[PDB]
Amino acid sequence: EGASFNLEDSGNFLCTTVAKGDSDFLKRLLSSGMNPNSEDYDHRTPLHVAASEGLFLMAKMLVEAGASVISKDRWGNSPLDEARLCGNKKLIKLLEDVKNAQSS
Amino acid sequence: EGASFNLEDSGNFLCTTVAKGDSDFLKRLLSSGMNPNSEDYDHRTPLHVAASEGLFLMAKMLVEAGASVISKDRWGNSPLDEARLCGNKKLIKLLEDVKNAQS
Amino acid sequence: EGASFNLEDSGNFLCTTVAKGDSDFLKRLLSSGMNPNSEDYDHRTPLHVAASEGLFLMAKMLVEAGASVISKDRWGNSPLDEARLCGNKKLIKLLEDVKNAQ
């Protein structure tokens, strides 16, 4: 029927969901695809939160939803920067390649 | 009756509520004794959000609730430090006074 | 029923309420029909006081109500001038956007 949350701050609710860490909840949400990424009160997209948290599965799944890596938090840090800070090889490679491609 | 909040992620919900910016509604939460020390997934206190955004009044009441200002976030900046980054002289003033009390 | 505030020294009361800093009280006040365009005896709008105090959330409520950004104070200073004195860059930006719109 064309399911779409379209909730108030649904992307910010995804920031709160990455705070929850429920990858299944997130997968079903992003299957409904309410929002790819949206800045939180810290101006951090849910991709920022996942990348800083090292949640590579959630971050890759958000990138599949459309969470951009060129977005930067309140302190001008992209999710790629957070992933590089974390040091997650798979997540670092994913965000490096995706953001470098996104620049073009 | 002693009914408490018992609400999941009190810190993150407080960050969200301060983000809304309803000073009297936060005050009503405080009349229910709302969680003084709070933090979201980025370890950012609602004090952090208020100070980075310069919400001096919200931070004023929240600190009145007994909120820890020396507490820092994922970035290692306290709400005092976040206000210093934002340069809210009045908010820096209040947070510094309460910190000198706390230190 | 068409309630109107009809309260003496409305601008002065609004400046004093900005001094109170109760954002919810002012939100409900100016959303109940009161106009914050009115200034005080010092011709300072409540927007003037908010901008000098750097009360961005409070001044944003104020502007949405209709508090003039190009109105001057007793000393001939706009709320934009008050924002520049405060040092709040973002407040300066929205006040400049409003002056251009107005």
Please tell me which chains touch B, using 3 or more CB pairs under 8 Å as the contact test.
Answer: A, C
**Contacts for A27-34 with beta carbons within 8 Å, 24 or more apart?**
A27/A61, A29/A5, A30/A61, A30/A62, A30/A64, A30/A65, A32/A3, A32/A4, A32/A5, A33/A4, A33/A65, A34/A4, A34/A5, A34/A6, A34/A7, A34/A10
Q: Which two tokens stand for residue C1?
A: 């029923």
Chain A residue numbers touching B40 (CB-CB < 8 A) = 19, 40-42
Q: Look up residue B26 and give its two tokens.
A: 């936060």
Q: What are phi and psi of B15, to 5 degrees?
A: -60, -45
Q: Which residues of chain B lie closer than 8 angstroms to C56, CB-CB?
A: 53-54
C-alpha to C-alpha distance for A97 and A49, rounded to whole angstroms: 19
Contact B43, B72 (CB under 8 A): yes
Q: How many CA atoms lie within 13 Å of A9's alpha carbon, on the beta-carbon side?
A: 14
What are the chain B neighbours of A20 within 8 Å (beta carbons)? 9
Chains meeting C at 3+ CB pairs closer than 8 A? B
Instruction: DSSP for C36-82, please give it.
Output: TT---TT---HHHHHHHTT-HHHHHHHHHHT--SS---TTS--HHHH
Sign of the alpha-carbon dihedral angle for A9, A40, B23, C101: negative
Q: What was the experiment behind these coordinates?
A: cryo-EM
Chain A residues inside the 8 Å CB shell of B9: 16, 19-20
In eight-state DSSP terms, residue A84 is H
Which tokens go with C53? 């105090």
User: In sequence order, what are the residues at sequence separation of 6 or more whose Cβ sits closer than 8 angstroms to the Cβ of residue B20?
Assistant: none
Q: Does B64 touch chain C (CB under 8 A)?
A: no
- What would the two tokens of residue B77 be? 């900046």
Chains B and A touch (3+ CB pairs under 8 A): yes
Q: Shortest CA distance to B36 belongs to which of B12, B56, B64? A: B64
Q: Hey, what's the torsion of the CAs at C58, C44, B88, B25, to 10 degrees?
A: -20
Contact (Cβ atoms closer than 8 angstroms) between residue B60 and residue B26: no
For chain A, count helices (H), then strands (E): 6, 0
- Please state the three-class secondary structure of chain B as a single string: CCCCCCCCCHHHHHHHHHHHCCHHHHHHHHHCCCCCCCCCCCCCCHHHHHHHCCCHHHHHHHHHCCCCCCCCCCCCCCHHHHHHHHCCHHHHHHHHHHHHHHC
Nearest CA-CA distance, residue B87 and chain A, Å: 14
How far is the C-alpha of C66 from the C-alpha of A60, rounded, in Å? 45
Is A22 touching B (CB cutoff 8 A)?
A: no
Q: Does A44 touch chain B (CB under 8 A)?
A: yes
Closest CA to A29 of A48, A7, A1: A7
Resolution (A): 3.1
* Distance from the first to the final alpha carbon of chain C: 31
**Amino acid identity of C48?**
H
CB-neighbour burial class of residue C95 (10 A; exposed 0-12, middle 13-18, buried 19+)? buried
Give the residue from chain B lying closest to A44, CA to CA.
Answer: B42
In the chain, the amino acid numbered A84 is R
C91: its two tokens: 């407040």
Exposure of A30 in the CB half-sphere (CA atoms within 13 A): 25
Residue A104 CB: number of other CB atoms within 10 A? 4
**CA-to-CA separations, B103 to A70, B59, B70, B88, B97, in angstroms, rounded:** 40, 18, 8, 21, 10
- Going from the C-alpha of A44 to that of each of A48, A77, A98, B46, C1, the distances in angstroms are 5, 9, 18, 15, 45
Q: Does B9 touch chain A (CB under 8 A)?
A: yes
Token couple for C17: 């309420």
Instruction: Count other Cβ atoms within 10 Å, centred on residue B100.
Output: 9
Q: Which residues contact C54 (CB under 8 A, 6 or more apart)?
A: B54, B56, B88, B90, C83, C86, C87, C88, C91
Output B30-34 pairs: Cβ under 8 A, ≥24 positions apart: B30/B61, B30/B64, B30/B65, B32/B3, B32/B4, B32/B5, B33/B4, B33/B65, B34/B5, B34/B65
